[PDB]
RNA sequence: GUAAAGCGCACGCAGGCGGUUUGUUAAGUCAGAUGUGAAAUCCCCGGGCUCAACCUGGGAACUGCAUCUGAUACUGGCAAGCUUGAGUCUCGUAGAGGGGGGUAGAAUUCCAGGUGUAGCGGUGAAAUGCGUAGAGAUCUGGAGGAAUACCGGUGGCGAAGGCGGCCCCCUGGACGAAGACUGACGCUCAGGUGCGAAAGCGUGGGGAGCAAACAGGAUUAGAUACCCUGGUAGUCCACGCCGUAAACGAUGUCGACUUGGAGGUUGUGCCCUUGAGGCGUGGCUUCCGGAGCUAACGCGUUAAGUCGACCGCCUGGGGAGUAC
């Protein structure tokens, strides 16, 4: 999946504080990680469809996370996108 | 409850979710009947039993099984009670009209041996027809005298006697039987959650009901 | 997923009844209580309790008359994705009267009879007969 | 499920549905009232032509729309939460899950040489065929492609198709455990997007074995077959296309309930485990079977039982999944 190091690292850079892995923001971040890192792996092989399934899931899951955030706090949503350069 | 402490549970681990409300535990990989509520059962049974048993209550003790067999006879034969311990004929209760016909044949067959009405035909025939009485006195013997369905019946185990019971409740005849784990209570209307075997266990309640029944005759 | 908690409660009872189960349990909620109450006031269930503090439970005891169960039939009516509202002069008559129809009125969750008399209509919930 | 009928399978926008608590609102909803809903029909009661048909007085009804005044249980909106739904983190567990690259051994075939000599191969027999130009058998050396005995299973993993030697790298999912965190972020999904056995198609490779086509031999009345001797496509590879199958459990997905028995597989708490073991407790999975369901066969806690949310589909046979 993801490296424990980078995992914990990104946990604070967005976590509401410390060791609070679960925040709508935290998740999105942890998601975009593998989401972007996988592309590098997918750029190659390409025919690894079965692994794509996972990639796509996290992709859609992320959208469902952001969509929610924006609904529960337009603030964090607009700010979160920036630190990740998401939303086009 | 006294002598009741001589049978406890029975059957390894096959039971039946229907006997649950009567099971105590299962020490040593074996279900143990809840005798703590078994004796109380005896009341409703032994009560209603002697009740109708008063007016020459036609009681039918059933115990086709081996163990109880040799015993079941004495019990019912200790008063105006009848018994059946040899392969319950198919319909000897419901199809009585037809079954009784065999009884009559048996009756007259006895008279044959009774007086000089036996010494007839070649030894072959005599020896031939004699065999007939043998089995007949087994499958219909302990019931030869009972013109008409019994007022009730007390079957040993509700399992091995599935056929017998099936007819009883069909003729609207109250059923009294000892059920346990593997047994199916949905049949008998008077649940007697107790060991379905154990030479001692069977004789224990066998005569027990016999007495109350014979005693109920004033 | 639980898109209809009311249905669960109802089904829980009928399923239990036929199962001879002594009593039934489930997560309580304002509405569930009101229904369970009417079910008791009408003589369909022995009683009912609500255990738990932070997590509400609902000790609903079933009732069995003779060698049979009291609730011979209980089905949901005004279910989700298809609501049902009637008028004072519309309330259905369960089992020609021998039955009851729990209807939520602006005055509370009462039985069809009561509602019809109070002159107010509401939302049906089930037809316990 | 087998009668017509579950998209081959997933992700998911619109749409439909939405755990739990308090407050608030009052839109749906309920109540009251006010407009209006033409008269005639219809309906009830009552009249008038001798009766009836017919005519007529009154009421009812017009199941509807709008306004106003309330009621607030439920649904909807809003506010603040909550944690059991869903998800996140930590640590493990098993796995023929997927993509890429290596590599080993058994065998077949082919090439070369040795030994050796009249058969071999095949069938029901045969025959075609291969053999004295020396086969077959036997041994040595080499080339090459494809597939991985045993383990292996009532087995495992995957959404489905499907995935078996061993090794490395990249990668997806599932499960348990203690717990820690977010706080309804959920379920379903027309259209859409993507995945899709085999056969087939395009380009360029590869080609041992097997084999549509094709050619012989045999069989038969015939034999455009089955059988035998050969053998091209293809089967293999890379990339692209084709989207079908009895794509089947002929059974859509998610969730909650409802007696049992025996077994497989994988995780885990606890107990002199002295030894395996015993008390359990999650995930996945076989077989039998109760209630109930079923036209029956049968299904049966992995339901085809009892219920809820959403979806797809059926409406007599042939013509025809055909024509346009
Ligand atoms: Mg067919
Ligand atoms: Mg069909
Ligand atoms: Mg399918
Ligand atoms: Mg009018
Ligand atoms: Mg509300
Ligand atoms: Mg192919
Ligand atoms: Mg090709
Ligand atoms: Mg599986
Ligand atoms: Mg079965």
């Amino acid at each position: 999946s993801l490296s424990t190091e980078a995992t914990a690292k990104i946990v604070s850079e967005f976590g509401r504080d410390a060791n609070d892995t679960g925040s709508t923001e935290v998740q999105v971040a942890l998601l975009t990680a593998q989401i972007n890192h996988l592309q590098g792996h997918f750029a190659e092989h390409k025919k690894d469809h079965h692994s794509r399934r996972g990639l796509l899931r996290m992709v859609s899951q992320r959208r469902k996370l952001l969509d929610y955030l924006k609904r529960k706090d337009v603030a964090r949503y607009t700010q979160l996108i920036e630190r990740l350069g998401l939303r086009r | 409850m006294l002598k009741a402490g001589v049978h406890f549970g029975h059957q390894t681990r096959y039971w039946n979710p229907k006997m649950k409300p009567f099971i105590f535990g299962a020490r040593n990989k074996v279900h143990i009947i809840n005798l703590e509520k078994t004796v109380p059962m005896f009341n409703e049974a032994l009560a209603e039993l002697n009740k109708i048993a008063s007016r020459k209550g036609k009681i039918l003790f059933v115990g086709t099984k081996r163990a109880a067999s040799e015993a079941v006879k004495d019990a019912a034969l200790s008063c105006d009670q009848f018994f059946v311990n040899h392969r319950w004929l198919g319909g000897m209760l419901t199809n009585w009209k037809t079954v009784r016909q065999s009884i009559k044949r048996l009756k007259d067959l006895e008279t044959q041996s009774q007086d000089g009405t036996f010494d007839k035909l070649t030894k072959k025939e005599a020896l031939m027809r004699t065999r007939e009485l043998e089995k007949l006195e087994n499958s219909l013997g302990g019931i030869k005298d009972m013109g008409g369905l019994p007022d009730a019946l007390f079957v040993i185990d509700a399992d091995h006697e599935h056929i017998a019971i099936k007819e009883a409740n069909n003729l609207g005849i109250p059923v009294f039987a000892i059920v346990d784990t593997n047994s199916d209570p949905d049949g008998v209307d008077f649940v007697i959650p107790g060991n379905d075997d154990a030479i001692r266990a069977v004789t224990l309640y066998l005569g027990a009901v016999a007495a109350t029944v014979r005693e109920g005759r004033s | 997923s639980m898109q209809d908690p009311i249905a669960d409660m109802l089904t829980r009872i009928r399923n239990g009844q036929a199962a001879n189960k002594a009593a039934v349990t489930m997560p309580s909620s304002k509405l569930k209580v009101a229904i369970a109450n009417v079910l008791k006031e009408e003589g369909f269930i022995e009683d009912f309790k609500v255990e738990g503090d932070t997590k509400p439970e609902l000790e609903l005891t079933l009732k069995y008359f003779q060698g049979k169960a009291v609730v011979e039939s209980i089905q949901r009516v005004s279910r989700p994705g298809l609501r049902i509202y009637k008028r004072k002069d519309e309330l259905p008559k369960v089992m020609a009267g021998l039955g009851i129809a729990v209807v939520s009125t602006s005055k509370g969750v009462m039985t069809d009879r009561a509602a019809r008399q109070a002159g107010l209509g509401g939302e049906i919930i089930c037809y316990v007969a």
Side-chain angles (χ1 to χ4, degrees), chain B residues 36-69:
Chain B
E36 4 268 294
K37 194 174 189 283
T38 295
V39 10
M41 310 256 104
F42 300 164
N43 295 50
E44 286 279 10
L46 261 31
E48 305 306 305
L49 209 54
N50 109 297
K51 188 266 184 179
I52 14 79
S54 59
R55 341 75 157 63
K56 303 209 85 172
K58 286 200 161 183
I59 321 301
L60 243 179
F61 297 54
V62 187
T64 310
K65 52 175 73 285
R66 172 51 168 278
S69 196

Side-chain angles (χ1 to χ4, degrees), chain B residues 13-18:
Chain B
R13 281 283 55 270
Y14 309 142
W15 80 309
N16 173 194
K18 288 177 179 186

Side-chain angles (χ1 to χ4, degrees), chain A residues 7-37:
Chain A
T7 297
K9 169 70 160 287
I10 191 162
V11 168
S12 280
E13 276 186 339
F14 296 95
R16 321 303 300 121
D17 46 89
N19 185 51
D20 69 283
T21 66
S23 171
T24 317
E25 306 180 305
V26 179
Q27 294 211 44
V28 175
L30 273 175
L31 271 298
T32 307
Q34 297 141 327
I35 287 297
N36 300 174
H37 182 291

Side-chain angles (χ1 to χ4, degrees), chain B residues 89-161:
Chain B
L89 279 293
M92 39 159 54
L93 225 63
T94 170
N95 187 0
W96 192 67
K97 52 181 278 55
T98 294
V99 180
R100 47 184 285 211
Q101 303 321 307
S102 298
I103 305 175
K104 180 269 182 183
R105 168 63 191 180
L106 161 140
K107 277 292 189 170
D108 62 65
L109 269 179
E110 286 183 315
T111 78
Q112 311 279 164
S113 57
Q114 163 214 268
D115 276 23
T117 142
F118 71 129
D119 208 312
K120 59 256 309 104
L121 226 293
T122 64
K123 313 306 295 180
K124 162 193 62 204
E125 170 53 72
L127 301 157
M128 174 188 262
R129 65 173 57 207
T130 42
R131 170 78 70 275
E132 176 171 338
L133 278 89
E134 314 183 340
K135 221 298 193 58
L136 278 175
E137 204 61 46
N138 319 154
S139 52
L140 294 173
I143 192 174
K144 63 175 181 191
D145 289 295
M146 189 221 285
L149 306 72
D151 309 1
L153 79 164
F154 185 86
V155 36
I156 180 72
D157 191 39
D159 237 273
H160 194 66
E161 298 321 320

Side-chain angles (χ1 to χ4, degrees), chain B residues 169-187:
Chain B
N169 32 52
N170 168 297
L171 293 157
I173 311 306
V175 184
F176 300 79
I178 303 179
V179 296
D180 69 314
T181 51
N182 71 326
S183 291
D184 177 279
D186 290 32

